[PDB]
Amino acid sequence: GGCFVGSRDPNETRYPKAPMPLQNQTSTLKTAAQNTPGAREAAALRDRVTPLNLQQVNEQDVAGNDPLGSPARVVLDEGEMYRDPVEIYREGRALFQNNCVGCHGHNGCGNVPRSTNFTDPGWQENNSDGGIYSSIYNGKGIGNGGGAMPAYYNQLSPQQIRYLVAYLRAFKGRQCNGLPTLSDVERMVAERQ
Amino acid sequence: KRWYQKLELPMPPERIFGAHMMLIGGLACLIGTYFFASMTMWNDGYVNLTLRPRLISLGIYDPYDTEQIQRVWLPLIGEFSTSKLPFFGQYPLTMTDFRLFGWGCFHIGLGLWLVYAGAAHYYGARGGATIGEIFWLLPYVPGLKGLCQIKWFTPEGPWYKVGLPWGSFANTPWPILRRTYADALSPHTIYIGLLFFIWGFVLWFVLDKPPVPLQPAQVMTPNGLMPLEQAPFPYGWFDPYLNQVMHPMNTINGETTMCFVWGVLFVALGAYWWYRPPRSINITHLEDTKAVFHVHLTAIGYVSFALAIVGFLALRNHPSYLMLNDMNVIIYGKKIVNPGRMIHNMITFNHVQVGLLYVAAGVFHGGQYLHGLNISGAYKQARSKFITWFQNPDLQTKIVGTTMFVSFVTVVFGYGMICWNTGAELDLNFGIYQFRSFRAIQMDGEAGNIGYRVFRPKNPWDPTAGGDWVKNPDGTAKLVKARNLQVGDRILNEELGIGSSPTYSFTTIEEINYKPEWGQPKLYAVQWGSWTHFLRKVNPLFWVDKGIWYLQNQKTFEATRKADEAYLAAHLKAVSLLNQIDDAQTEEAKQKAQAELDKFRPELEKAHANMLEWNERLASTPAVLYSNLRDQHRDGEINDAIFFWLMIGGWLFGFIPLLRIAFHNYQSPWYRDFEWRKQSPDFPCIGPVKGGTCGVSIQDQLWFCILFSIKPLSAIAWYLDGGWIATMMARGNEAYYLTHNISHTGGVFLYMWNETTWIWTDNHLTAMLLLGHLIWFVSFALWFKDRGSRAEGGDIQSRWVRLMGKRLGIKTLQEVRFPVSNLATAKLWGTVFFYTGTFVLVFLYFADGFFQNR
Amino acid sequence: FHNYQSPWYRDFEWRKQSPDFPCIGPVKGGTCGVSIQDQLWFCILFSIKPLSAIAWYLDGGWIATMMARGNEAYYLTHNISHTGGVFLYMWNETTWIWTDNHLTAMLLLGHLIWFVSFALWFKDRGSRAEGGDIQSRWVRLMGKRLGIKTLQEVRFPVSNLATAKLWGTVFFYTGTFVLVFLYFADGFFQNR
Amino acid sequence: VMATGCFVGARNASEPRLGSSSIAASRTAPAYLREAQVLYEGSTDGLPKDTPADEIAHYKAMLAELQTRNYAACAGCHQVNGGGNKAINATNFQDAGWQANNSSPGMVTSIVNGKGKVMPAYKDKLTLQQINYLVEYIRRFEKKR
Ligand code: 2GO
Ligand code: 2GO
Ligand code: CLA
Ligand code: CLA
Ligand SMILES: CC(C)CCCCCCCCCCCC(=O)OC[C@H](OC[C@H](C[N+](C)(C)C)C(=O)O)OC(=O)CCCCCCCCCCCC(C)C
Ligand SMILES: CNCCOP(=O)(O)O[C@H](COC(=O)CCCCCCCCCCCC(C)C)OC(=O)CCCCCCCCCCCC(C)C
Ligand SMILES: CNCCOP(=O)(O)O[C@H](COC(=O)CCCCCCCCCCCC(C)C)OC(=O)CCCCCCCCCCCC(C)C
Ligand code: HEC
Ligand code: HEC
Ligand code: SF4
Ligand SMILES: [Ca+2]
Ligand SMILES: [Ca+2]
């Protein structure tokens, strides 16, 4: 094992994103490409494909340490949350594929016993967006660190949980072959988020 | 048995020389291919990822390079028929692809040339060698026999076929040549000095990174020409992740100036040895290559260990790896979380592995030279102090026994503290003791106005105690506001919403208005329960780290302390005023109290803003030893203390068999008492006498060191990767870890499960998981006291199969005998299987990504 | 059949002299594990494998592959309910096991009993006897130096090969099967 | 010998009503669901006209005490029959997709902690044994499809 990996997909650019800010998003201290031959196509292409909030986040920025990150105080502004499907797709698929696939499957239909199944309409209709935030932040079930659905209040930021909330509504009524695509997110957002 | 014993030392100089030169050429060819696999048309994989931060720091890999090239050295460069630059003219190539291509081709050309020349020294040694013995599976091709019977590298030949015209180094009369390995120690280090100069000149003039203090005022960037101190990382010295100008010796221009510093030092130490070469009587036996092999191989192992430590600290927060986090790293279709730290962790753990393997092996090869001295009767005659200092058996038993004791005490302390705090985090009732968890409740701000029912004892200090629920004057259970909790109060677990501690009912307030030394800038009521938070201080490295750090940051530390003290006084007075309100009883007295908290609200606001901002500043000061994912101070943790005790105790556990190799290769105190003597270095036992005697030889002691060392090596892997090592069951999302601003991925066992959620997302990583687990447990078939059973049963199988062959007519089946591994070759392959099974699985822990909060 | 002579013994003229001897080797490459007592222990281990097939199957694992996910397209289209798939079952059930603190304590103790069986089952008893001997000498030196009479004749006991194989099988068995109790104790998650 | 029995402790249950074991009641489905329906509805009115005089007045005393701690009944957010209110986003317990995608253990903590914005926390209002009873009553609201 080594070297004979494939060719990289031309659509995944390596053209670099701006660095993650040193300052905390929750800071009270002071708050929260060129014309070179192909540099503009590469920047425009990075703007759709390369995720910006995938990395674990500063420790003072996690939702349990954020003053506005508790389920009671978070802002779920529907206009900001369902504003941009590129963005929901860019971010939520990277976060979901990393963190949530293990237990909920590669299709998002449930792996671990009793685990959620996000394609189910009955489950979709009976959950708020704020409800979905609560269960990510708290976990579900009794146990240390959440229950069988683990808690995320150390781990994820409020902004990271919100991309997750919007992405999860693209699962509605899909078949059990992998994850929601860019056009699933877009049909979800057109039918009012 | 002897198949891995073909080439054994001592060898003659020309044969060692020639094989090293040939291996060097071979490595240069492999690196050349790694340069080809770095080109931008390929996927990210582990091979090209482990070299990219270095090629960025060198200027050869340019992340902001987008243009495609069509003419650069000579008129034929877009794409063309039969590649134009074969197999590469299919894809768009950039300038970094061409830089990569060229350095690849350069490493393959040098490598092939070095392979040829090495062969000239190796085979011209023996007076030449024929083509069919060099290549050896070349006479099997037919109609090419004549071809393979020419002689190359002959002492006589015309210029393109010579080896060594004089036959040996010793016979050639060039009077510069040194004649003993001690005399050669001087030219070998002048030579290494020369290598350092080569590298410095290549960095200065080919790669264009001159040495400090001669760095340019200006450097070209993708956004134009900028001044060195504002140009971001690969171009200039501005670090764009940490927002600082880099120290000059933290750039590659620093590394080019050290090229000259180290090269001057090696040239001068080598010229000193030219004139006064080493001559001690304590050194003279080291001319035999069996003896030096020990010295050199164990030293090299120590060098690797030190590469790991030095490289890990120096590069943990350097912009070459953090730059990886900005590219869009995708491995087997995924997208990696913090690739920077993942590749950094891989390289340092690689080196730690190599460190162990070579210290252990070097000592084994040492024990082989000593055993041969004992066999041949010469041990007793040896003259060097480095042998005779250890010849006394009474001193050997005191050395081994006191390091066993020191190991015992440090490992009992560490493992016992792990067990204690996992008991505490799990709330386990033992009948004789109830373990209790850490829980916190915020006492200040808005949280401090949530009420609870409190069972409050009358007088803790006297037995025949009693308590009562806190009531109102009419007799109803009154709700106590978290701001008003006291030490000794009990709040029901169910009302705090806690399951998971079913054997007791209450949480107890043990400290009130607690502010973490290092953590969240909040005030808590706390249950400490059994949770030993003081154990972080039972670490010498806590105190050194925090002392240096305090001395460097002492003014903002002092202003932070004073801002905390002012906020506590202001919160305390707010709680008085809020309480007067709540206990008014007269709509007038209520209204007037409310008036005075209203006019004190501003300036509680101000004391809280002041405290928050000073705490934010203090937590942005630069790290000394213990750091953040940024490069900021963190206080030492229980994790860091346990790691500290575990390194002492666990490396002694691993290295005690090396001491036994060193002292008892021939006789140990058990042996000497029976009058026994170990006849070879690798026998498996001598049978069932005296209870059983398996595992006394030095080859077996070698295998034990390696298995035992698996344990400090896994503690290192878990620590590098973000696991909590101080308990077994710790979860990241819990109150202790969030109040103290700690990020971790696990808890010994809990890490295994939690990281595997990430492993499961990758199909290639899970196939590796399945296989590496198959390899390990098969090692048990080879290590158990079971080989007689296996041979007896393989005889039954042989017999059956030959029966079938007679009955069936199958001549090739009619004499079949299954081979069953004998005892030594079983212990060897069982150890090989046990080791490769475990460390293919540990690779997976690094390769799922790095998930500690930043 | 082979309590006294197997065909490998009978080619050599050997004759097993008792039912529980550890070996007679290093001859002929080595002979550890031919007695009847040892064949009993190898039965107990080998049988762990069909028994764990039975446990996974009772408790709802999928045994026909190693990584079946609960609701993969195949299982959903063919109305099959399972809890995991060989390895995946292991991690799937343990997330349920982690939510109980009594069962996680049992999990920790179970793991420790087992790997200690390896100390007792590896070809290593001579190493352990010769190190124990260094340990005894040392402790007696400390007794004599510090004037502590209870410690100037310490001799650490080190199991011989037969008793090491007995207690190694005991520790291996009990480790595994406390841990299996947990796969049942966690719940039956098959939803039918 | 070992488990001489097994020392697991006494079971936690709800309030005692004289002459009728509360511990026993907490494992007998028809008793526990009668108390769950009272909590759920906030009244004793929908209880079987066969209910005894002592039972009907013990429930009232339970409610009266809970009314002084500002307890809000489940019905009428969720209705007397389930499947709440789309307006308020109040969960529909009659729905099979909602029922399949919840475990009973998991459901517990969502009542204890509350759930996002509106569904209130009940950890300071009710005992964990009274939440267990309610999880059991909500199970019986399920309809097919
Ligand atoms: C957790 C999810 C998954 C499941 C399905 C799983 C199951 C199982 C089973 C089973 C039937 O359920 C088995 C039998 C099993 C077996 C193995 N696994 Zn396994 N396994 C999984 C996953 C993994 C992974 C990723 C890994 C193993 C690794 C390994 C290895 C273990 C190799 C070994 O013997 O390792 C000893 C080292 C250990 C246990 C790590 C200790 C870490 C700790 C931080 C050390 C520090 C503290 C200690 C208390 C010691 C202090 C004193 C001292 C320093 C002297 C083998 C193949 C392996 C490993 O730990 O290797 C060191 C590894 O990396 N495994 N494993
Ligand atoms: C997230 C999972 C979690 C972690 C913390 C964990 C880790 C690890 C490690 C590690 C360092 O990572 C180790 C080293 C380890 C060790 C063990 N664990 Zn372990 N382990 C976990 C959990 C558990 C649990 C609950 C259990 C074990 C069980 C066991 C046992 C297993 C002992 C053993 O030898 O078991 C042999 C049987 C096996 C491996 C089961 C095979 C099942 C399969 C369905 C049978 C049929 C299919 C095959 C292809 C059959 C062959 C055909 C024929 C001959 C029948 C030991 C102590 C144990 C067990 O498997 O016993 C059969 C057990 O019950 N473990 N285990
Ligand atoms: C992978 C697991 C594995 C396998 C397949 C075996 C196989 C066997 N063992 Mg070994 N053994 C194992 C692990 C295993 N063992 C472990 C963990 C220990 C320590 C407790 C032992 C200790 C041991 C003892 C003391 C003895 C054996 C014996 C046997 C043989 C039994 C006679 C027979 O009944 O044929 C039936 C054969 C089978 C049921 C096996 C079919 C084969 C397999 C599953 C295919 C193997 C796949 C392989 C891993 C993949 C690599 C191949 C690669 C090219 C793809 C059998 C060949 C006895 C023997 O007779 O020795 C010769 C014996 O006395 N075993
Ligand atoms: C828990 C695992 C464990 C522990 C604690 C030990 C302990 C030891 N082994 Mg054994 N061993 C083990 C597992 C273990 N081994 C395994 C899995 C194997 C298979 C490879 C072996 C194979 C083996 C060989 C071949 C040899 C030893 C030897 C040693 C001793 C080394 C001398 C010394 O370093 O003093 C230092 C002492 C320590 C470092 C350990 C302190 C006590 C520990 C930490 C905790 C006690 C834990 C125990 C589980 C507690 C239960 C207590 C009860 C009240 C609950 C030491 C007594 C050597 C020896 O000299 O023989 C006597 C030896 O030759 N080990
Ligand atoms: C490393 C790999 C890349 C493969 C290597 C090349 C070969 C690949 C393909 C498999 C080759 C199998 C050959 C097996 C064979 O014929 O073995 C015979 C052999 O020796 C006996 C004689 C030589 N006397 C003994 C006379 C000197 C001979 O044949 O040459 O053996 C052994 O003794 C080793 C055991 C080989 C395994 C064969 C067992 C086959 C299983 C059959 C069981 C059931 C019966 C009824 C069919
Ligand atoms: C998730 N991130 C965790 C690390 O965060 P961060 O960045 O805050 O902090 C440094 C620790 O990281 C290391 O730096 C580990 C590198 C491992 C490779 C290096 C691991 C090798 C360790 C020791 C090697 C021993 C060998 C040579 C015998 O945290 C340190 O203080 C470690 C200092 C190590 C010194 C301990 C001294 C003990 C003495 C040992 C005696 C042994 C003998 C007598 C036989
Ligand atoms: C002449 N010499 C050789 C021939 O005779 P030979 O080998 O049979 O002598 C043995 C050997 O030595 C051991 O075998 C080592 C034990 C010490 C390791 C010490 C390490 C043990 C710790 C292991 C724990 C790990 C588990 C929990 C995972 O004969 C035995 O020990 C037979 C085993 C019987 C032991 C019975 C244990 C019951 C005691 C429980 C109550 C005691 C206290 C609670 C008061
Ligand atoms: C350890 C396994 C595991 C991981 C990791 C995990 N989950 Fe789950 N999840 C579950 C289980 C089990 C349930 C069912 C809980 C219940 O009802 O018992 C669940 C349920 C949920 C629910 C429904 C909650 C509700 O109340 O209805 C949401 C939303 C959820 N998960 C989202 C996520 C997201 C997002 C991630 C990654 C951040 C994630 N999960 C990670 C196991 C897990
Ligand atoms: C004021 C309204 C209100 C009252 C009173 C109320 N609920 Fe809810 N409940 C809601 C709303 C709104 C939601 C939707 C939650 C969300 O956002 O997802 C909900 C959600 C739920 C859910 C589904 C939770 C889940 O995880 O999926 C359960 C179960 C539930 N409530 C039970 C109760 C019980 C039992 C009570 C009374 C003891 C109760 N509720 C009282 C409004 C209420
Ligand atoms: S079982 Fe093997 S190692 Fe042990 S005494 Fe017998 S031949 Fe020697
Ligand atoms: Ca990791
Ligand atoms: Ca189960």
CSV table of N, CA and C in Angstrom, one decimal, chain A residues 144-169:
chain,number,residue,atom,x,y,z
A,144,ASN,N,-22.9,8.9,30.8
A,144,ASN,CA,-21.8,9.8,30.9
A,144,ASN,C,-21.6,10.4,29.5
A,145,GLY,N,-21.5,11.7,29.3
A,145,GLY,CA,-21.3,12.3,28.0
A,145,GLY,C,-22.5,12.1,27.1
A,146,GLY,N,-23.7,12.1,27.5
A,146,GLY,CA,-24.8,11.8,26.6
A,146,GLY,C,-25.1,10.3,26.7
A,147,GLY,N,-26.1,9.7,25.9
A,147,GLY,CA,-26.4,8.4,26.0
A,147,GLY,C,-25.9,7.6,24.8
A,148,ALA,N,-26.7,6.8,24.2
A,148,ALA,CA,-26.3,6.1,23.1
A,148,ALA,C,-26.1,7.1,21.9
A,149,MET,N,-26.8,8.2,21.8
A,149,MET,CA,-26.7,9.3,20.9
A,149,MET,C,-25.8,10.2,21.8
A,150,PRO,N,-24.5,10.3,21.5
A,150,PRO,CA,-23.6,11.1,22.4
A,150,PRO,C,-23.8,12.7,22.3
A,151,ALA,N,-23.5,13.4,23.3
A,151,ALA,CA,-23.6,14.8,23.4
A,151,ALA,C,-22.4,15.4,22.7
A,152,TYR,N,-22.6,16.6,22.2
A,152,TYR,CA,-21.6,17.3,21.5
A,152,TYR,C,-21.2,18.7,22.1
A,153,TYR,N,-21.7,19.2,23.2
A,153,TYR,CA,-21.4,20.5,23.8
A,153,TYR,C,-19.9,20.9,24.1
A,154,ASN,N,-19.0,20.0,24.2
A,154,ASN,CA,-17.6,20.2,24.2
A,154,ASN,C,-17.3,20.0,22.6
A,155,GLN,N,-16.6,19.3,22.0
A,155,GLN,CA,-16.7,18.9,20.5
A,155,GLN,C,-17.2,19.9,19.4
A,156,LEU,N,-18.4,20.3,19.2
A,156,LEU,CA,-18.8,21.1,18.1
A,156,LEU,C,-19.1,22.5,18.4
A,157,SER,N,-19.1,23.4,17.5
A,157,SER,CA,-19.5,24.8,17.7
A,157,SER,C,-21.1,25.1,17.4
A,158,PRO,N,-21.7,26.3,17.8
A,158,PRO,CA,-23.1,26.5,17.5
A,158,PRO,C,-23.4,26.6,16.0
A,159,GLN,N,-22.4,27.2,15.4
A,159,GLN,CA,-22.4,27.3,13.9
A,159,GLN,C,-22.1,26.0,13.2
A,160,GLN,N,-21.3,25.1,13.7
A,160,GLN,CA,-21.2,23.8,13.1
A,160,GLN,C,-22.5,23.0,13.3
A,161,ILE,N,-23.2,23.0,14.5
A,161,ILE,CA,-24.4,22.3,14.7
A,161,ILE,C,-25.5,22.9,13.8
A,162,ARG,N,-25.6,24.1,13.5
A,162,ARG,CA,-26.5,24.6,12.5
A,162,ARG,C,-26.3,24.2,11.1
A,163,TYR,N,-25.1,23.9,10.6
A,163,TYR,CA,-25.0,23.4,9.3
A,163,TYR,C,-25.5,21.9,9.4
A,164,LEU,N,-25.2,21.2,10.4
A,164,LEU,CA,-25.7,19.9,10.6
A,164,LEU,C,-27.3,19.9,10.6
A,165,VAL,N,-28.0,20.8,11.3
A,165,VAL,CA,-29.4,20.8,11.3
A,165,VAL,C,-29.9,21.0,9.9
A,166,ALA,N,-29.5,22.0,9.1
A,166,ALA,CA,-29.9,22.2,7.8
A,166,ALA,C,-29.6,21.1,6.8
A,167,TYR,N,-28.6,20.3,7.0
A,167,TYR,CA,-28.2,19.3,6.1
A,167,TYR,C,-29.0,18.2,6.3
A,168,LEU,N,-29.3,17.8,7.6
A,168,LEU,CA,-30.2,16.8,8.0
A,168,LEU,C,-31.6,16.9,7.4
A,169,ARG,N,-32.1,18.1,7.1
A,169,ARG,CA,-33.4,18.1,6.5
A,169,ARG,C,-33.4,17.8,5.0
